[PDB]
C-alpha cells in the first residue's frame, strides 16, 4: 500500500503547475508574458544595456485557445552551450548569485515550457546572439520531465549580418486573452512607468500595437554581486561560505573578508561574544561553533547597515513623479529608506503616498506593490504589504472620514525577495521586512499629516 | 559575467523556506506541528486504524527560542530501509499515487528538517515499529543539502517486547510560542471536530495538557487508489500512462483499461471523435495524436462521474453536528455534493452554513476552509473559497442587513488539492473547482434562504397583530 517514490524538480512542477503561477489559462498567459519580460530586462539593464523589448501575443487556434507568446530583446544573449539547460532544466539559473535581479528560482521560463508541453505539441523556440557573436544560434526544445533535462528538437545557427545581439523566445500555451487582457496591459504600463530608460512595443492578439518610448538614456547603476550581511546568515550558509574558500582563512580573517559591514574591530567583538578563537582555522569550525556564530550574528546590536549601493531602487523622485502622472493628486510624498538586512540579505523599502485630486473616493487606499522593480498584480490581500497597510491606523495621520482619496505605494528590493509562492505575486510575512515596511509607511504618513493639517485650516 | 548553476530540491527549499510555510519562527512552529500531525493521520486512518496522537512541544532553550516538537502515533510505522529517504530526501513520498491523503508533495517533514539544521545542531530523531515488526528502529538524521540525501548520524534497534506499532518524530526548531499559540490550538481543535474517531493529547510549552477524547469508534471507509478519470488528463500524463504499460495494448484497450468511466462504447466514441484507429498500438501514438486524445477528453460531454472510492468526506451529519457544537446557531444546513473531476482527479466539495444563535455579529461571514480534512488557517483572502464567498450576493438568499451572524464552511477533497503554495494554506483558482464550490454554496444558501423566508413570513403574520 505504501510505495515509496521520488520526483524530479520537473515532475514536481508539472504535477503542481498552480505552484508556479499556472493555475488556469488566464493566469498562465499573464505569467508567461511577465516571466519573458523579466528575463529580457534582467538580460539588459543588469548589464548596462538600454532595454528594447518587443512583446507579441497571437491567437494561434481559436477553438483550442492556444496562444503563441514571443518576446524579443537586445540583451546579452545566452552562450549557445547553456541554452538547453537555461530553458529545459528545472532549477537552472545564472542568478543564484547574491545580487538584485528579477529572476531568482531558476524555474520561471521552464514552468511556461512545462505548461506548454502539457497542453500542445509545438516546442519552445529560442534564437540568441551573445555580444560580438558572428552567429545567431537557433533552438527548438522540450523538457524530459523524468530526467529533468532538455530534449533538443532542433539546433542550428545562421550568420549574423546586421551584427546585433539579444534573444527571442517563443512559446505556445493555452490562454484566455479576454480574461488576462486588463492585467497584462497594467503589468506592462506599470513596468514602463518605473523603467523610463526602457522601450517596449506590445502587439496583442486583437492586433493592437502599443508603443512605449524611451524617456531617458540614463540607466541606474547596475546591481552587482555583493557579500552577505552577517545579520541572519544561517548555519547552512556558514558551511557554504567555508566550503567555498580558496584561502586557509582563520575565523577572524573569515569575518572581515566574507561579509559586508565587518571591519577588524567588529570581528573581534563578535569572536568574543561567540566564544571563538580568532586564530583558529575556519575550515575546522565544529557543528556547535557554527551554531554559536549564527546566534551571535542574530543578537549583535551594533552592526552597520549594509551598503545601499548593493541594490537598485526606483527613487523618491521617480516615485512621486509617477504618482502625479497617473493619479493627478493634490498631494504626494515618498521616501527611499536606508538599507537594512534580513537573513543575510540587504534590502531597501521605498514608500510613496498620494492624496486628493483625480483619485477615486473609496473605503480603503489603493495599494500599489513592487518587488525588485516588478509590479505585483495578483493576490494583493495575501501580501505582507497589504497586512501592514490594513493594520496601520490612518486616523492617527489625518484620515478623517471612513471615505478618502488615497494611494499607497511600496517597493521592496533586495538580493532576495521572499515570495509566498514560486508564482511571485506576493511577499511573505518575514518579520524584519514587515517592521521596515511599517516604519517606511509611517515616515510618509507623517508627511501626509503635515499636509492634511495645513489643508484643514484652509477649510476652517 | 553570468555563471550558470543548478540547485538540488533541498538547496531550493533551504534558500527559500518561505515557499514551504517557513517564513518566520511563529509560522515555522505551526507548520512543523501540522506536518507531523497530518503524517500521523495519514499513517493511521488511511489504513483503517483509529488514530491515537500525542503532540508535545517543549521549550529547550529560552534565549535561542529553540523548541522540540514531538508527535507520537499508532500508525503503520515505516520500513527501516525507507526511513532515511522518507525524512531526509526532498521530493520523496509514499503518497504520489491516486488516492486522497493529506500529504502530497513529499516535502513537508523535510522542510522542517531543513529549517531545523539551518538554525540549530541537533539531528531529528525518529523511532518506528511497523505492524508485526519484532523491533523498534531508531534513527538520528540530517540532510546533505547539496546531494539532497540523508545523513544517518545514528541508527539503532531495540526488541519490541510489547507489540507496539507506530512512529515518534521529534525535531528541534526556532519557534515563537506566544504568536503561534492560538493558531496551533485552533488547528488541533478544528481537526478534532471533524475527526471524532481520533483521540488527541496535547502538551504545550507552558506545561498545559489538553485531552481530546475519541467520540466514536467507527472509522470512515479508507480511500483506495483509483485510475484517473479522463476529463482533464494532460499530454505528459498520457505519456506516463503509456510508458508504465506492461502490455502491448491497442488504443481501445488503453482507454478501457487505464481510465475510470470508460467502457467499450464510450471508448469507440472517443476513438471516433479523436480520429484514432482503435487497433493501433498505443505505444505508437504520435505527439499530434496524443494532443487529439487530450482535447477529446477535454471536450467530451458524456463521461460518467468518477466514483468516490478514492475520497473520504466529512459527511453531512458530522458537518452539521460540528457547526452546532461550536457555534450553537439557530439554523444549520450542509451538503455533500456528488463527485466531479478536474485534471483527471476525482473531487468532492462539501458545504455548510450556520446562522444566528451564538455566532458573533459582523460585516462578513466567518469562513471555515478545509482541504482533505485539513483545516486551513492562514492566507484566507487569497483562497478561491474566500473569493467565491465574497462574490456571492447574500441578499438574494434572504440576508437583509449589512450586519449578520453567519458561518460558512467549505471542504474540498480530492486525490489532488491545488494549493497556491507548498505551505498548503490556501486553494488556487482552478476553474472547475471554483464553479463547483459556487454550486455547493448556492445549494446550502438556498436552504438558508428557506429558513429566513420562514422567519420573515411569521414576522409578517405577527406584524398584522400590531
Ligand atoms: N532573454 C534572455 N536573455 C538572457 N538570458 C536569459 C533570457 N531568458 C532566460 N535567460 C537565462 O536563462 C536562465 C533561466 O531563466 P529562468 O528559468 O526564467 O530563471 P531565472 O530568471 O530565475 O534565473 C536565467 O538565469 C538567464 O540566465
Ligand atoms: N508518522 C509517520 N508514520 C508513517 N509514515 C510516515 C510518518 N511520517 C512520515 N512518513 C512517511 O514519510 C513520507 C514523507 O513524508 P512528507 O515529507 O511529509 O511528505 P508527504 O506527506 O507529502 O508524503 C510520507 O509519504 C510517509 O510515507
Ligand atoms: Mg526568469
Ligand atoms: Mg506529509
Q: Name which residue sits closest to atom 1 of ligand 2, judged by CA.
A: B40
Domain A1-217 part of CATH 3.40.50.80? no
Min Cα distance B210 → chain A (Å) is 30
Q: Following CA atoms A254, A417, B121, B30 in sequence, which dihedral angle do they give, to the nearest 10 degrees?
A: 160
> Which A residues 417-456 touch B at CB under 8 Å?
418-423, 426, 428-431
Tell me if chain B has a CB within 8 Å of the CB of A371: no
Residues of chain A with CATH 3.30.230.10: 312-460
Q: Residue B424 and residue B108: Cα distance in Å, rounded?
A: 10
Q: Which three cell numbers stand for residue A41?
A: 530586462
**Cβ(B350) to ligand 2 under 6 A?**
no
Q: Are A39 and A109 in contact (CB under 8 A)?
A: yes
Nearest ligand to the CA atom of A92: 1
Q: Residue B127 and residue B169: Cα distance in Å, rounded?
A: 7
3-state DSSP assignment of residue B210: strand
Q: Residue B309 and residue B94: Cα distance in Å, rounded?
A: 19
Min Cα distance A34 → chain B (Å) is 18
Q: Which three cell numbers stand for residue A70?
A: 514571443
Q: Residue B276 and residue B292: Cα distance in Å, rounded?
A: 8
Distance of CA B443 to the CA centre of its chain: 24
Q: Residue A187 and residue A377: Cα distance in Å, rounded?
A: 7
The CATH architecture of the domain made up of A227-304 is Orthogonal Bundle (1.10)
Length of chain A: 460
Query: Nearest-CA neighbor of B297 among B339, B328, B330, B254?
Result: B254
Q: Residue A69 and residue A36: Cα distance in Å, rounded?
A: 9
**For the purposes of burial, counting CB atoms within 10 Å of the CB of A166, is it exposed (0-12), middle (13-18) or buried (19 or more)?**
buried
Q: Which three cell numbers stand for residue B134?
A: 519484532
Resolution in A: 2.2
Write out chain B residues lying below 8 Å of A15, CB-based. 96, 416
The half-sphere exposure of B157 on its side-chain side, counting CA atoms within 13 A, is: 9
Phi, psi of A337 (to 5 degrees): -70, 160
Q: Residue A76 and residue A365: Cα distance in Å, rounded?
A: 40
Give kind and range of the element (H or E) at residue B284: none
Min Cα distance A167 → chain B (Å) is 15
Q: Residue A288 and residue A65: Cα distance in Å, rounded?
A: 58
Q: For testing the chain A interface, which of B81, B96, B239 should be mutated: the one with the most A CBs within 10 Å?
A: B96
Q: Answer positive or negative: Cα dihedral of B63, B65, B66, B72.
A: positive
Q: Name which residue sits closest to atom 9 of ligand 1, judged by CA.
A: A39
Nearest CB to A235 within list B89, B117, B287: B117
The reply to whether A211 sits in an annotated binding site is no
Write out chain B residues lying below 8 Å of A45, CB-based. none
Q: Are B171 and B121 in contact (CB under 8 A)?
A: no
Q: Are A199 and A212 in contact (CB under 8 A)?
A: yes
**Cβ(A424) to ligand 1 under 6 A?**
no
Distances (CA, A) of A7 to A267, A314, B48, B340, B464: 44, 40, 27, 27, 70
A144 pairs with which residues across the strands? A149
Residues of chain A with CATH 3.30.565.10: 1-217
Q: Residue A339 and residue A353: Cα distance in Å, rounded?
A: 20
CATH top-level class of B312-466: alpha beta
Q: Residue B3 and residue A307: Cα distance in Å, rounded?
A: 24
Q: Which atom of ligand 1 is nearest to the CA of A94?
A: 25
Q: Which three cell numbers stand for residue B114?
A: 531543513
Nearest CA in chain A to B26: A431
Calculate how far, in angstroms, residue A109's C-alpha sits from the geometric centre of ligand 3.
6
**Cβ(B319) to ligand 2 under 6 A?**
no
3-state DSSP assignment of residue B19: helix
Query: Nearest-CA neighbor of B382 among A191, A380, A321, A160?
Result: A380
Q: For testing the chain B interface, which of A15, A17, A18 should be mutated: the one with the most B CBs within 10 Å?
A: A18
Q: Name which residue sits closest to atom 6 of ligand 1, judged by CA.
A: A39
Chain breaks in chain B (C to N over 2.5 A) after: none
Phi, psi of A32 (to 5 degrees): -70, -40
Phi, psi of B222 (to 5 degrees): -55, 140
Query: Strand A199-203 relative to strand A209-212: parallel, antiparallel, unpaired?
Result: antiparallel
Residues sharing a CB contact under 8 Å with residue B264, sequence separation 6 or more, in sequence order: B252, B256
Q: Which three cell numbers stand for residue B42?
A: 495519514
Q: Which of A41, A103, A164 to mutate to test the pocket of ligand 1 (most atoms within 8 A of CB)?
A: A103
Q: Which three cell numbers stand for residue B123?
A: 539531528
**Cβ(A32) to ligand 1 under 6 A?**
no
**Count of beta carbons in the 10 Å neighbourhood of residue A29:** 27
**For the purposes of burial, counting CB atoms within 10 Å of the CB of A452, is it exposed (0-12), middle (13-18) or buried (19 or more)?**
middle
Q: Residue B369 and residue B364: Cα distance in Å, rounded?
A: 15
Q: Which three cell numbers stand for residue B444?
A: 446550502
Calculate how far, in angstroms, residue A123's C-alpha sits from the geometric centre of ligand 1.
17
Q: Residue A344 and residue A259: Cα distance in Å, rounded?
A: 9
Q: Following CA atoms B457, B459, B462, B466 in sequence, which dihedral angle do they give, to the nearest 10 degrees?
A: -130
Q: Are B264 and B256 in contact (CB under 8 A)?
A: yes
A333 pairs with which residues across the strands? A353
Tell me if chain A has a CB within 8 Å of the CB of B7: yes
> Which B residues 197-226 touch A at CB under 8 Å?
none
Angle between helices A108-119 and B235-243 (to 10 degrees): 70
Q: Residue B399 and residue B402: Cα distance in Å, rounded?
A: 8
Calculate how far, in angstroms, residue B352's C-alpha sits from the geometric centre of ligand 1.
46
Give kind and range of the element (H or E) at residue B86: helix B83-88
DSSP string of B304-340? PPPPSTT-----HHHHHHHHHHHH--SEEEEEEPPPE
Method: X-ray
**Cβ(A104) to ligand 1 under 6 A?**
yes
3.30.230.10, 3.40.50.2300, 3.40.50.880, 2.60.120.1310: which CATH number matches A312-460? 3.30.230.10
Q: Residue B182 and residue B169: Cα distance in Å, rounded?
A: 23
Buried b (16+ CB within 10 A) or exposed e, A130-150: beebeebbbbbbbbebeebbb
Tell me if chain B has a CB within 8 Å of the CB of A295: yes
Calculate how far, in angstroms, residue B128's C-alpha sits from the geometric centre of ligand 4.
16
DSSP state of B423: T
Q: Which three cell numbers stand for residue A113?
A: 515550457
Query: Nearest-CA neighbor of A386 among A414, A367, A407, A362?
Result: A367
The half-sphere exposure of B137 on its side-chain side, counting CA atoms within 13 A, is: 19
> Which B residues 117-136 touch A at CB under 8 Å?
117-121
Residues of chain B with CATH 3.30.230.10: 312-466
**For the purposes of burial, counting CB atoms within 10 Å of the CB of B211, is it exposed (0-12), middle (13-18) or buried (19 or more)?**
exposed
Query: Strand A166-174 relative to strand B345-355: parallel, antiparallel, unpaired?
Result: unpaired
**Count of beta carbons in the 10 Å neighbourhood of residue B401:** 8
Query: Strand B406-414 relative to strand B366-371: parallel, antiparallel, unpaired?
Result: parallel
Min Cα distance A289 → chain B (Å) is 10
Query: Nearest-CA neighbor of B67 among B35, B28, B97?
Result: B28
Query: Nearest-CA neighbor of A25 among A60, A65, A81?
Result: A65
DSSP state of B376: E
Nearest CB to B94 within list A4, A105, A118: A4
The reply to whether A105 sits in an annotated binding site is yes
**Cβ(B110) to ligand 2 under 6 A?**
yes
Distances (CA, A) of A18 to A364, B33, B186: 29, 25, 27
Q: Which of B46, B100, B103, B111 to mutate to test the pocket of ligand 2 (most atoms within 8 A of CB)?
A: B103
Write out chain B residues lying below 8 Å of A418, CB-based. 16, 18, 23
Write out chain B residues lying below 8 Å of A12, CB-based. 9, 91, 105
Nearest ligand to the CA atom of B105: 2
**Inter-chain CB proximity A105 and B16 less than 8 Å:** yes
Q: Which three cell numbers stand for residue A363?
A: 473605503
Q: Residue A71 and residue B2: Cα distance in Å, rounded?
A: 21
**For the purposes of burial, counting CB atoms within 10 Å of the CB of B279, is it exposed (0-12), middle (13-18) or buried (19 or more)?**
exposed
Distances (CA, A) of B329 to B109, B353, B406, B407: 38, 10, 9, 9
The half-sphere exposure of B340 on its side-chain side, counting CA atoms within 13 A, is: 17
* Distance spanning both ends of chain A, measured CA to CA: 77
Query: Nearest-CA neighbor of B225 among B26, B40, B47?
Result: B47
A71 pairs with which residues across the strands? A55, A169
Q: Are B203 and B188 in contact (CB under 8 A)?
A: no
Angle between helices A316-327 and A177-194 (to 10 degrees): 130
**Cβ(A73) to ligand 1 under 6 A?**
yes
Q: What is the largest CA-CA distance in chain A?
A: 77
Q: Are B51 and B40 in contact (CB under 8 A)?
A: yes
Distances (CA, A) of A368 to A185, A363, A410, B55: 15, 16, 6, 42
The 3-state secondary structure of chain A reads CCCCEECCHHHHHHHCHHHHCCCCHHHHHHHHHHHHHHHHHHCCHHHCCCCEEEEEEEEEECCCCEEEEEEEECCCCCCCCCHHHHHHCCCEECCCCCCCCCCCCCCHHHHHHHHHHHHCCCCEEEEEECCCCCEEEEEEEEEECCCCEEEEEEEEEEECCCCCCEEEEEEEEECCHHHHHHHHHHHHHHHHHHCCCCEEEEECCCCCEEEECCCCCCCCCCCCCCCCCCCCCCHHHHHHHHHCCCCCCEHHHHHHHHCCCCCHHHHHHHHHHHCCCCCCEHHHCCHHHHHHHHHHHHHCCCCCCCCHHHCCCCCHHHHHHHHHHHHCCCEEEEEECCCEEECCEEEEEEEEEEECCCCCCECCCEEEEEECCEEECCCHHHCHHHHHHHHCCHHHHCCCCCCECEEEEEEEEECCCCECCCCCCCECCCHHHHHHHHHHHHHHHHHHHHHHHHHHHHHC
Write out chain B residues lying below 8 Å of A422, CB-based. 19
Nearest ligand to the CA atom of B111: 2
**For the purposes of burial, counting CB atoms within 10 Å of the CB of A390, is it exposed (0-12), middle (13-18) or buried (19 or more)?**
exposed
**Cβ(A43) to ligand 1 under 6 A?**
yes
Give kind and range of the element (H or E) at residue B135: strand B135-144
DSSP string of B219-281? PPPPP---PPPSTT--HHHHHHHHHT--S--BHHHHHHHHSSS--HHHHHHHHHHHT--TTSB
Residues of chain A with CATH 1.10.8.50: 227-304
Length of chain B: 466
Amino acid at each position: 500500500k505504501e510505495k515509496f517514490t521520488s520526483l524530479s524538480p520537473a515532475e514536481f512542477f508539472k504535477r503542481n503547475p498552480e505552484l508556479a503561477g499556472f493555475p488556469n489559462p488566464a493566469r498562465a498567459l499573464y505569467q508567461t508574458v511577465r516571466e519573458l519580460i523579466e528575463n529580457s530586462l534582467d538580460a539588459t539593464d543588469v548589464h548596462g544595456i538600454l532595454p528594447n523589448i518587443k512583446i507579441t501575443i497571437d491567437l494561434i487556434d481559436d477553438a483550442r485557445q492556444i496562444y503563441k507568446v514571443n518576446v524579443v530583446d537586445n540583451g546579452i544573449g545566452i552562450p549557445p552551450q547553456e541554452v538547453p539547460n537555461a530553458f529545459g532544466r528545472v532549477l537552472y539559473s545564472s542568478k543564484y548569485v547574491n545580487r538584485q535581479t528579477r529572476g531568482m528560482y531558476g524555474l520561471g521560463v521552464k514552468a511556461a515550457v512545462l505548461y506548454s508541453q502539457m497542453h500542445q505539441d509545438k516546442p519552445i523556440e529560442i534564437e540568441t546572439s551573445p555580444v560580438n557573436s558572428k552567429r545567431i544560434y537557433t533552438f527548438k526544445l522540450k523538457i524530459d520531465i523524468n530526467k529533468n533535462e532538455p530534449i533538443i528538437v532542433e539546433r542550428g545557427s545562421v550568420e549574423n549580418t546586421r551584427g546585433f545581439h539579444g534573444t527571442s523566445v517563443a512559446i505556445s500555451i493555452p490562454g484566455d486573452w479576454p480574461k488576462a487582457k486588463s492585467r497584462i496591459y497594467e503589468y506592462i504600463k506599470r513596468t514602463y512607468i518605473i523603467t523610463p530608460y526602457a522601450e517596449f512595443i506590445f502587439k496583442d492578439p486583437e492586433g493592437n500595437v502599443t508603443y512605449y518610448p524611451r524617456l531617458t538614456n540614463k540607466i541606474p547603476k547596475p546591481p552587482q554581486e555583493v557579500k552577505p550581511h552577517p545579520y541572519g546568515v544561517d548555519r547552512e550558509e556558514i558551511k557554504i561560505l567555508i566550503n567555498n574558500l580558496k584561502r586557509d582563512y582563520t575565523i577572524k580573517e573569515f569575518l572581515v573578508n566574507e561579509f559586508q559591514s565587518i571591519g577588524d574591530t567588529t570581528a573581534d567583538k563578535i569572536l568574543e561574544l561567540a566564544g571563538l578563537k580568532p586564530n583558529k582555522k575556519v575550515k575546522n569550525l565544529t557543528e556547535e561553533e557554527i551554531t554559536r556564530l549564527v546566534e551571535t550574528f542574530k543578537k549583535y546590536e551594533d552592526f552597520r547597515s549594509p551598503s545601499a549601493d548593493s541594490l537598485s531602487v526606483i527613487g523618491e523622485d521617480l516615485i512621486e513623479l509617477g504618482l502625479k502622472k497617473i493619479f493627478n493628486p493634490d498631494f504626494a510624498a515618498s521616501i527611499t529608506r536606508k538599507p537594512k538586512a534580513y537573513q543575510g540579505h540587504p534590502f531597501i523599502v521605498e514608500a510613496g503616498v498620494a492624496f486628493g485630486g483625480s483619485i477615486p473616493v473609496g473605503e480603503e487606499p489603493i495599494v500599489l506593490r513592487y518587488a525588485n522593480k516588478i509590479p505585483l498584480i495578483y493576490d494583493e490581500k495575501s501580501d505582507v504589504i497589504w497586512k501592514v497597510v490594513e493594520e496601520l491606523d490612518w486616523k492617527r495621520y489625518g484620515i478623517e472620514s471612513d471615505q478618502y482619496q488615497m494611494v499607497v505605494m511600496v517597493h521592496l528590493c533586495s538580493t532576495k525577495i521572499p515570495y509566498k509562492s514560486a508564482g511571485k505575486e506576493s511577499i511573505a510575512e518575514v518579520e524584519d521586512i514587515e517592521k521596515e515596511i511599517k516604519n517606511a509607511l509611517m515616515e510618509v504618513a507623517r508627511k501626509l499629516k503635515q499636509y492634511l493639517s495645513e489643508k484643514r485650516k484652509e477649510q476652517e
